[PDB]
Amino acid sequence: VEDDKEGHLVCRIGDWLQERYEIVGNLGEGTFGKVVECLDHARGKSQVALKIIRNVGKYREAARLEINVLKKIKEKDKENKFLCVLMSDWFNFHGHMCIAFELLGKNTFEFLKENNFQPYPLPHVRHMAYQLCHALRFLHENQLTHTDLKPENILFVNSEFETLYNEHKSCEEKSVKNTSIRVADFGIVATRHYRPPEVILELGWAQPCDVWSIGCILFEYYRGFTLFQTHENREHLVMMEKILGPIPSHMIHRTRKQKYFYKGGLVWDENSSDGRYVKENCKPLKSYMLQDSLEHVQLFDLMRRMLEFDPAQRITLAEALLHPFFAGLTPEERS
Ligand SMILES: CC(C)(C)c1cc(NC(=O)Nc2cccc(-c3c[nH]c4ncnc(N5CCOCC5)c34)c2)n(-c2ccc3ncccc3c2)n1
């Protein structure tokens, strides 16, 4: 046991925790501390993720809050059946709160990056979407809101793939063998590209925030690239307007950030570097359909309804789980 003045724990591959956890790898780091891989010698050689949070205090406090959140998700989920990440253990170790999870596979972003940003096929989209909706419905019902939904926070149970590619000129694609996912959270709300306009405009958010993000995420699974490829609010709102249509007067009246607008409209210099990028790449949403086909149109219908500007007219996760799009699930996918 040795601590540095930043507080954090100095651990080495081969160190043991709770006489059952043998560190074998490294999986992450962040504000709060490390995230290592162990084999659980108690539960018999099997593999876990272990977020370590040492001293600091706010860290320890927030770790407790996380554990509680995850405790409550288990209690409220009997059969594991709501597709959130599952805490298998937690403990206290010379001040360092630790939280063990079953080790899942690559997240939906990584997998996409490993596939050279070749989009997932429409059935995978459909299945992943169904589970994201189910999962966040369950969370919303228990007065919980993710707020930082994004592809990196969706993990595949198993990210093994069957590489398969013929005929297509440069066919070289990986289909993941099993599209089951789990929702995690690594820990202005949201990440830029998944952030909804009410957060951008500082109008307060609630559950409808998660739906907007889901909307954004589905698009990315479907095209391989992000729907809003930008890093600044004004551009982002302009992009919203050209992809989706105008912004309700009512949301412009309530913005205290009265800098992006002028006389009811977004200030926007159509002929700049930013101007040209938007002009030569942002087209109306429907135009990004890859095929002229019912299930693709169903998907864009759910997507448009998920990306309503007004959080109050935006579809709920309950209403989406009943959207025709989800007719095409295999019966097995249905659970
Ligand atoms: C259920 C919900 C809502 C989605 C959630 C999940 C988590 N925690 C989490 O995902 N933790 C976590 C932390 C570290 C690893 C993994 C993880 C679980 N399997 C894995 N299988 C493989 N790799 C993993 N990753 C390692 C790299 O890195 C991403 C996950 C993992 C998961 N939280 C959460 C998080 C932080 C909080 N802070 C304060 C208050 C409340 C908090 C709640 N809420």
Author numbering: 136 to 322, 334 to 481
Quote the study on this structure.
Increased kinase activity of leucine-rich repeat kinase 2 (LRRK2) is associated with Parkinson’s disease (PD).
Unfortunately, RN129 (28) was not only, by far, the most potent LRRK2 inhibitor designed using our hybridization approach, but also the most promiscuous one, showing high thermal stabilization of 49% of the kinases screened. To elucidate the binding mode of RN129 (28) and to inform future design strategies, we obtained a co-crystal structure of RN129 (28) with one of its potent off-targets, CDC-like kinase 3 (CLK3), a kinase that has been crystallized routinely in our group. Our structure revealed that RN129 (28) has a canonical type II binding mode that has not been described for CLK3 previously. The hinge of CLK3 contains a leucine residue (L238) that is also present in LRRK2, whereas most human kinases have larger phenylalanine or tyrosine residues at this position.
